[PDB]
């Protein structure tokens, strides 16, 4: 039973060039636990905390990777996320709308 | 607090 | 709702190496608190929430020696259940296990539980009369025998009625201001233009808790959620919730349209619209 990452970039509050906020990727709905994520800025890897490997009642694990950051006009940000079940990584660029 | 048993599967 | 202590445990083989990892998070509702992972520098349970961090280090001596018995034992586990469906000795595989107890009004148990996975994919339970087994398959029914001949339910039930609801009331109490107070949603409407034909309406629900929410789209009091756009409740990273709804109203239409928000955080339900 494998199943793949589903993923939600965003940040914690709603962004506003020059002011401080937090940029997250959500990773859950997979199985099994072995996953690589990394967060993006303008394509290259930062330095990043997560939560703890939790799971759900369909027993599906989620996690949440997030660093400090500050958004301006200029900058592009995304995650990148890499699992048994991808062909590929999956990367996901920010969308401050969504 | 953690329940305190250890029974093999 | 009914508040409930919980804790989630995951053993994955490493045969690769000739060992396992265990990882232990403590939940009480969806506020995480405590955690351990047997692959951390000399590994201890740590804290994971502001209110627990004032616990004395018999406290954590406790929680910890139990996880490195617990971890330890999972080690021969994964090997048992890999025997039991004759699998390889190659691949990585998981267990996984909840178990918990709800406060109910009189500060009893309201109900206890545990559950048990092998590879994603129910394994064995016990029944909400704490007192027997229900098992999936073959090899659950080995070890649901097993737990009959030792009488596991009943150090289970013993706990679950006791020592669970009793530290869960503590829980409640030490991070009372944030576990049993409910947080309302920062709420509001953003517009995004698609085509000629298309306007996109967001309404926005920041910073909650508890995880619980409605948010609807109406049209002149007519539901919209057939083809309203509705995303998974997400973690702020404060141990908060977001969630947003959207849906492409056509470009004059935006005051015809209304986002109804409920949490319990709010007095009165909320009806936004655009400005």
Redo the contacts between chains.
């Keep these: 039973?494998?199943?793949p990452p589903?993923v939600?970039v965003?940040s914690?509050?709603?962004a506003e060039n020059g002011k401080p906020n937090?940029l997250?990727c959500?990773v859950?709905g997979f199985?099994?636990?072995?996953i690589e994520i990394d967060l993006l800025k303008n394509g290259e890897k930062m330095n990043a905390e997560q939560?703890?490997?939790?799971?759900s009642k369909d027993?599906?694990?989620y996690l949440?990777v997030?660093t400090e950051f500050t958004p301006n006009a200029v900058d592009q940000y995304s995650c990148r996320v890499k699992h048994v079940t991808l062909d590929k990584p999956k990367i996901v660029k920010w969308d401050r709308?969504? | 607090?953690?329940?305190?048993?250890?029974?093999?599967? | 709702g009914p508040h409930s202590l919980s804790?989630?445990y995951?053993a994955?083989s490493r045969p690769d190496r000739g060992d396992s990892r265990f990882?232990?998070?403590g939940?009480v509702d969806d506020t995480?608190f405590v955690?351990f992972?047997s692959d951390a520098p000399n590994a201890k349970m740590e804290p994971?929430a502001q209110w627990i961090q004032q616990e004395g280090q018999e406290?954590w001596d406790?929680?910890t020696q139990?996880?490195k018995?617990?971890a330890?034992?999972y080690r021969?586990?994964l090997n048992?259940?890999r025997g039991?469906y004759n699998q390889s000795e190659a691949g990585?595989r998981?267990?996984?296990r909840?178990?918990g107890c709800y406060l109910g009004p009189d500060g009893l148990l309201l109900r206890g539980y545990r559950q048990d996975?092998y590879?994603?994919?129910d394994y064995i339970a016990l029944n909400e009369d704490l007192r027997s087994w229900t098992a999936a398959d073959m090899a659950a029914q080995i070890?649901k025998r097993?737990?009959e001949v030792?009488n596991?339910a009943e150090?289970?039930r013993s706990?679950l009625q006791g020592?669970?609801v009793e530290?869960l009331q503590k829980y409640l109490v030490m991070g009372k201001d944030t576990l049993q107070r409910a947080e309302p949603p920062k709420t509001?409407v953003?517009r995004?233009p698609s085509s000629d034909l298309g306007v996109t309406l967001?309404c926005?629900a920041?910073?909650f808790y508890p995880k619980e929410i409605s948010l609807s789209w109406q049209r002149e009091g007519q539901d919209q959620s057939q083809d309203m756009e509705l995303?998974?409740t997400?973690?702020?990273?404060?141990g908060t919730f977001?969630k947003?709804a959207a849906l492409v109203v056509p470009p004059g239409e935006e005051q015809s349209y209304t986002c109804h928000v409920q949490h319990e955080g709010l007095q009165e339900p909320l009806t936004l619209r655009w400005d």
Excluded: M
């Design positions: 039973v494998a199943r589903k939600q965003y914690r509050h709603p937090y997250n959500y859950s199985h099994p636990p072995q939560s703890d490997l939790s799971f027993w599906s694990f949440l997030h709308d969504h | 607090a953690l329940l305190r048993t250890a029974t093999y599967y | 804790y989630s995951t994955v990882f232990i998070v939940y995480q955690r992972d994971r406290y406790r929680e139990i996880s018995e617990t330890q034992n021969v586990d048992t259940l039991y990585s998981t267990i996984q909840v178990y996975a590879d994603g994919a070890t097993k737990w030792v596991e150090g289970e706990y020592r669970c530290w509001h953003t995004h967001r926005w920041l910073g995303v998974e997400r973690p702020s990273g404060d977001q947003w």
